[PDB]
Amino acid sequence: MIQQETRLKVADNSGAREVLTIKVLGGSGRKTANIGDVIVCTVKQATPGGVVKKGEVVKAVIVRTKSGARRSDGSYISFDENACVIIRDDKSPRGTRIFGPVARELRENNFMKIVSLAPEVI
Amino acid sequence: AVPFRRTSKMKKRLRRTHFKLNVPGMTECPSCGEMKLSHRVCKACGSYNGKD
Amino acid sequence: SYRKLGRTSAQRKAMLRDLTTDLIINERIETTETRAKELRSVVEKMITLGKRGDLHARRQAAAYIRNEVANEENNQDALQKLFSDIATRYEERQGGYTRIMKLGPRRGDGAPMAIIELV
Amino acid sequence: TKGILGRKIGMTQVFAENGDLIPVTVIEAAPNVVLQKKTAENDGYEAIQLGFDDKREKLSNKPEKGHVAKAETAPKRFVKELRGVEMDAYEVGQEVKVEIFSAGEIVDVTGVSKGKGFQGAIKRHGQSRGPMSHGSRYHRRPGSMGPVDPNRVFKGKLLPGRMGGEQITVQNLEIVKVDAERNLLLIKGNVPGAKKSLITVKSAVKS
Amino acid sequence: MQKLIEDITKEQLRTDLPAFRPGDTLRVHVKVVEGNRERIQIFEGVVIKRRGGGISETFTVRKISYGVGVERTFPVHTPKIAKIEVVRYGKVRRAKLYYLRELRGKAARIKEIRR
RNA sequence: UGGCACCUCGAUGUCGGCUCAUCGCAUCCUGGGGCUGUAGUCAGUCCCAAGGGUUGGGCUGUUCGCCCAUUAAAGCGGUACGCGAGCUGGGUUCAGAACGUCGUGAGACAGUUCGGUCCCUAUCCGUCGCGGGCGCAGGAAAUUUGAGAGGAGCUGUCCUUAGUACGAGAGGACCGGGAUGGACGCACCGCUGGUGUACCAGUUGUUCUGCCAAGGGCAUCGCUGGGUAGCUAUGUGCGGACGGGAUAAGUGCUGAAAGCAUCUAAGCAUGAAGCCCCCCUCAAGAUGAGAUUUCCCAUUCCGCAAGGAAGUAAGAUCCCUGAAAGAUGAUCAGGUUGAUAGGUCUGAGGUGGAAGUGUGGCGACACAUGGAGCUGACAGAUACUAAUCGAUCGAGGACUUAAC
Ligand SMILES: [K+]
Ligand SMILES: [K+]
Ligand SMILES: [Mg+2]
Ligand SMILES: [Mg+2]
Ligand SMILES: [Mg+2]
Ligand SMILES: [Mg+2]
Ligand SMILES: [Mg+2]
Ligand SMILES: [Mg+2]
Ligand SMILES: [Mg+2]
Ligand SMILES: [Mg+2]
Ligand SMILES: [Mg+2]
Ligand SMILES: [Mg+2]
Ligand SMILES: [Mg+2]
Ligand SMILES: [Mg+2]
Ligand SMILES: [Mg+2]
Ligand SMILES: [Mg+2]
Numbered sequence A: 001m002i003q004q005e006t007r008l009k010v011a012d013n014s015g016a017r018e019v020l021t022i023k024v025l026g027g028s029g030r031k032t033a034n035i036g037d038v039i040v041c042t043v044k045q046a047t048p049g050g051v052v053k054k055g056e057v058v059k060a061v062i063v064r065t066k067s068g069a070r071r072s073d074g075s076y077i078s079f080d081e082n083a084c085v086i087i088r089d090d091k092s093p094r095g096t097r098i099f100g101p102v103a104r105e106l107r108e109n110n111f112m113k114i115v116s117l118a119p120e121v122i
Numbered sequence B: 001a002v003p004f005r006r007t008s009k010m011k012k013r014l015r016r017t018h019f020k021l022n023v024p025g026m027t028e029c030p031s032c033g034e035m036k037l038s039h040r041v042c043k044a045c046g047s048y049n050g051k052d
Numbered sequence C: 001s002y003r004k005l006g007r008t009s010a011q012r013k014a015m016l017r018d019l020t021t022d023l024i025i026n027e028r029i030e031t032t033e034t035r036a037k038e039l040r041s042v043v044e045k046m047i048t049l050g051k052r053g054d055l056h057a058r059r060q061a062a063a064y065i066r067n068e069v070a071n072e073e074n075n076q077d078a079l080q081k082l083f084s085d086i087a088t089r090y091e092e093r094q095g096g097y098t099r100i101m102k103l104g105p106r107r108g109d110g111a112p113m114a115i116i117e118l119v
Numbered sequence D: 001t002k003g004i005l006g007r008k009i010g011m012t013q014v015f016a017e018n019g020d021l022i023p024v025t026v027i028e029a030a031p032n033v034v035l036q037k038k039t040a041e042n043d044g045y046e047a048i049q050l051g052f053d054d055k056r057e058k059l060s061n062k063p064e065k066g067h068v069a070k071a072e073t074a075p076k077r078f079v080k081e082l083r084g085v086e087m088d089a090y091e092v093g094q095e096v097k098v099e100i101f102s103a104g105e106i107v108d109v110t111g112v113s114k115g116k117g118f119q120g121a122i123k124r125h126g127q128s129r130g131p132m133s134h135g136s137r138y139h140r141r142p143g144s145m146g147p148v149d150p151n152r153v154f155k156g157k158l159l160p161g162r163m164g165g166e167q168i169t170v171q172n173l174e175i176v177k178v179d180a181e182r183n184l185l186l187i188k189g190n191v192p193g194a195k196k197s198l199i200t201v202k203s204a205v206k207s
Numbered sequence E: 001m002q003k004l005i006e007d008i009t010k011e012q013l014r015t016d017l018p019a020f021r022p023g024d025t026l027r028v029h030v031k032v033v034e035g036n037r038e039r040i041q042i043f044e045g046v047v048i049k050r051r052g053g054g055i056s057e058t059f060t061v062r063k064i065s066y067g068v069g070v071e072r073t074f075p076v077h078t079p080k081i082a083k084i085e086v087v088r089y090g091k092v093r094r095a096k097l098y099y100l101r102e103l104r105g106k107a108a109r110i111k112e113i114r115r
Numbered sequence F: 001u002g003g004c005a006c007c008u009c010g011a012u013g014u015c016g017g018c019u020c021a022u023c024g025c026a027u028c029c030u031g032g033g034g035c036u037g038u039a040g041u042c043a044g045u046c047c048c049a050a051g052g053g054u055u056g057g058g059c060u061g062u063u064c065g066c067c068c069a070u071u072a073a074a075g076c077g078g079u080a081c082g083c084g085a086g087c088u089g090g091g092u093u094c095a096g097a098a099c100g101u102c103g104u105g106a107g108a109c110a111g112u113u114c115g116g117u118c119c120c121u122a123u124c125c126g127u128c129g130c131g132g133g134c135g136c137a138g139g140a141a142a143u144u145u146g147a148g149a150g151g152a153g154c155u156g157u158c159c160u161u162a163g164u165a166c167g168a169g170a171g172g173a174c175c176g177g178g179a180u181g182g183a184c185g186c187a188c189c190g191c192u193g194g195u196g197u198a199c200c201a202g203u204u205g206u207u208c209u210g211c212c213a214a215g216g217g218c219a220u221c222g223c224u225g226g227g228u229a230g231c232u233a234u235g236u237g238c239g240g241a242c243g244g245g246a247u248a249a250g251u252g253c254u255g256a257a258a259g260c261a262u263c264u265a266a267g268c269a270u271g272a273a274g275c276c277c278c279c280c281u282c283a284a285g286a287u288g289a290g291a292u293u294u295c296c297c298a299u300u301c302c303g304c305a306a307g308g309a310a311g312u313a314a315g316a317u318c319c320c321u322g323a324a325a326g327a328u329g330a331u332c333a334g335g336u337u338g339a340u341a342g343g344u345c346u347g348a349g350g351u352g353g354a355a356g357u358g359u360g361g362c363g364a365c366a367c368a369u370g371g372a373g374c375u376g377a378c379a380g381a382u383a384c385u386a387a388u389c390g391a392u393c394g395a396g397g398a399c400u401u402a403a404c
């Protein structure tokens, strides 16, 4: 459950280390984002010499959450952290490598580049 | 909040209608003949379900 | 659910343990009707322990029964009486060891009083 | 329109053939009996009166026994009517069984919601609290009763009061399974009421 | 528990699953279906929780994947699990191993207890 | 913004915010249209339309405004610039102090700054819930009709139609199908979680059960890890769907008055998220007190009658065991040919391997006996305990006419 002021780890090499959630997209009063949802965020921590720089307003997709996601078959998946990937509008990641496992839910939302790049898609 | 007008004797009496007691739920004790409360042991003779 | 009897958890447990030992010693006490109704289940479960008779059951009962003299002549405690007299009395009775009999309301606070005794 | 009376037994879950885990409510409906057919001519409207759950003789009174005499059945604890039914397809004394429904059928379920007793505006009407800190002394209160001009409160200003225990219909539930041997309906999702409460399952009115 | 609900759900309970407790390490062969084709994906981790009864019983397995711990919760009797292997029987002292959530590395080890 | 000074100075509390809304339409979005310097996509302007909806932050006491990020949209006003016996008290105008400035001065603002007590147990109406009484031409038990009232009413994106109509290109539809969300509402606890102070376990200090072992008290439930029922959202299921009738703006058909023309005068259509229904809930005190099924049956007294009194019928209550119900009444499940609650027995779920004993170890401790022991509310069974005996209430059915 990602909301405004939630800080996320970045699971790629775009240059951002930590982002702060500015806004959850996709409906007027929408309070919370979950895995697979796109958020607007600011880069709070950046890697020196990265493509993305501290203080930039970027779009990201949430790839891991502590709350996790329930599946139709009645199973659940949770992670120990909330992580996102900086993206463009076409849903390609702005980085080139994805770190850590990502949820199967990204395939449903057509984040296929991210899924292919992930070291594990659970 | 304080009473804006005094209560009339009629309004006072109308309120107190339901401020009432009921007759107790009595039943004669078949052993000693004193009246007890239904389902209670008889205080007078100490009988219950025909036993003292 | 269960009753709170206007007391905190610790006070309520203390009162129920007191009443249980009081009822074991005297075999009949008068109390408030609601206290009697709660006592029923507590005491009967203690009597079940007595019927079991084994050391494990006894220690469970020892943790609950107050350390009070049930019979001064024999120097018999409440716990010894529970296992040696109560249990022997109800060896062939499956449950229902106590009965509640209602008295009138108590003067002073109108409390409905009751007799609770071993059957 | 089809319908049947039953008791709410509880909830569980069932795996679908495609692997999905579907939560279901178990409704137990011993065969209902048609006690009376009301007609437009005699009564002014068409309806079928279903009796459910045979009551002990001792608990039944003489007026009840006479009413169910024509149907030749034991007195029933629950009697309800169904309107919109095919009158000619029903006869007094006919037993209505769960097998009128089939798996996959869409139904509406009526029941009485669980009682909650006296509840405040927050719980009863989902209103917002005031601040809990910053000096606030307004936490679970129902809000201003209205403007000054009318010199009175408008009807429908929501306030504390008894909550729950109202008749409530859930629409468009799916029948998951019909256990004719045990007279059970498995309905997807949940329905109003406590366990053992009377439930009515009708063919969906929006179908 | 109501006896009726146990009877209704009895058919759908699975009988081939091995006995395991919190603390044991399992390989869960999960039948992943992407539509027409299905591929068995193995999830290996520690059983940290096993709650509920009957058809509604669920269990949670935890593993560290690429530095990030992942927990998956399954219905025990789900048909979506092809097979469960008990790789290792762990010695624990409680039913819910929630403390493992805060631990990593050597602190997160579970002593083995040859069954 | 003013003008007036009519009400209030034996008191009508202020700006902003919070909670709760309600109304108007001069319509911000959604719906339907006319005109266009409307190719398409977009727009401009005007008409109809108030059903629903109409964001979260940075700065500031702020209203406002600028900015950041969204949204279909971020509408304008009234309600004592709605709402302080509902809250807040940051701004402003009590007493302190200080700066700038003015004054000979006490002090003051043509300016700032730091600090500064928000009282009231609801009598009446009103509002939200719950009962008692009587009535409804006999007395009862159920099931109901619906005059009437309330609720709900929102909308995005994507796929398809179709890269089609349109256009030189750029770009890019109407209408019609289909999927999936946001906000909102209803219900429910099977799932994910929260809580769970009479559940299980670990553990510290001290005191107690004579001591060991095993336990009790107190330390926020001593603390810590879990957790049953119940209650719950952030969890789950479902809803605003299909449509009918009459209309608004608009579009018309036939058609004169007025040989033509004309949507109109007679006549006949079409046409909105709006109106009346459809959908959900309450509803016969609807005193106009309705309808259907079933049950009881014409008693005994007096009085010339009218009428009164007394036992009862069907039925219900008092009282009692309770919870699926509940502030209390009420409601519902039961009251001995009874499973209503407790207990007992068997389980579920929960905890997680009891005590005793044995073995291994110098010892802390480990292991076996043994998924053990323990277990509030959950399930089934079982009259073992309590639902005793009793008491109270409750009909005999007016007159007129009409038809039988
Ligand atoms: K001077
Ligand atoms: K739950
Ligand atoms: Mg204490
Ligand atoms: Mg406070
Ligand atoms: Mg007025
Ligand atoms: Mg378990
Ligand atoms: Mg004048
Ligand atoms: Mg005055
Ligand atoms: Mg005044
Ligand atoms: Mg207008
Ligand atoms: Mg004002
Ligand atoms: Mg006021
Ligand atoms: Mg102030
Ligand atoms: Mg008044
Ligand atoms: Mg449960
Ligand atoms: Mg010791």
Ligand SMILES: [Mg+2]
Pocket: none
């Ligand atoms: Mg002390």
Ligand SMILES: [Zn+2]
Pocket: B029, B030, B031, B032, B033, B034, B042, B043, B044, B045, B046, B047
């Ligand atoms: Zn007596």
